Amino acid sequence: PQITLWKRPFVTIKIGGQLKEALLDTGADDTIFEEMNLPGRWKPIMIGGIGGFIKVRQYDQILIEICGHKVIGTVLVGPTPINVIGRNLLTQIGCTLNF
Amino acid sequence: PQITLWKRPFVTIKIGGQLKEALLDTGADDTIFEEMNLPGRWKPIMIGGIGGFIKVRQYDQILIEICGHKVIGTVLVGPTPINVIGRNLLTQIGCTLNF
Numbered sequence A, B: 001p002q003i004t005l006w007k008r009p010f011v012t013i014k015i016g017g018q019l020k021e022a023l024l025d026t027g028a029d030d031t032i033f034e035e036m037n038l039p040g041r042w043k044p045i046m047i048g049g050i051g052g053f054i055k056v057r058q059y060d061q062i063l064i065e066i067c068g069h070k071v072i073g074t075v076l077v078g079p080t081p082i083n084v085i086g087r088n089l090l091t092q093i094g095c096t097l098n099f
């Protein structure tokens, strides 16, 4: 699909058997989700943003179904105010900016 | 142009007679720039992101030439780690996400 930007570009996603909405974020290097139940081991990391830094749990090789598109990549879980799909996964669905 | 997301989508922009690079950020509602010399009045406000909030100077009806496209809108100036072009201006150049 082609998505305009008059509203926040939210999409429906399936991850860890759970349904969630996430923001298509070209400004996000990596994908991050609010606190959620994901299986397996994880590594502590910290990411940086406009307001400073947050500590998040890094999960690798996580399956996401983005608007009916399956992708596998790194998914961070932590205190983000909003779920964000980062470029690490946007590339896998062939997402592009156009103007 | 069509922009893939294997690299940070930076574009060159001219604002207040100054040359700068800014990140096409679909996850950014509004445009914000690092500290810079901008003319006119401004209103103090605070915006929020990952890791928290920052206090920024809000300027309205500011002219930006984004990759050869002229636009006029609100531009925030403050301690962002990166210059970001927000949806408030992306819409005016007709920018869209595609996959």
Ligand SMILES: CC(C)CN(C[C@@H](O)[C@H](Cc1ccccc1)NC(=O)O[C@H]1CO[C@H]2OCC[C@H]21)S(=O)(=O)c1ccc(N)cc1
Binding pocket: A025, A026, A027, A028, A029, A030, A031, A032, A047, A048, A049, A050, A081, A082, A084, A086, B025, B026, B027, B028, B029, B030, B031, B032, B047, B048, B049, B050, B081, B082, B084, B086
């Ligand atoms: C610091 C920038 C590179 C912005 N980033 C993505 C961006 O889309 C965030 C994503 C975002 C969105 C909502 C809340 C927090 C973060 N938006 C943002 O901070 O912009 C602010 C200016 O416009 C306002 O609109 C809301 C946020 C404000 S980021 O959140 O910090 C980020 C950084 C690293 C990763 N791996 C993932 C995300």
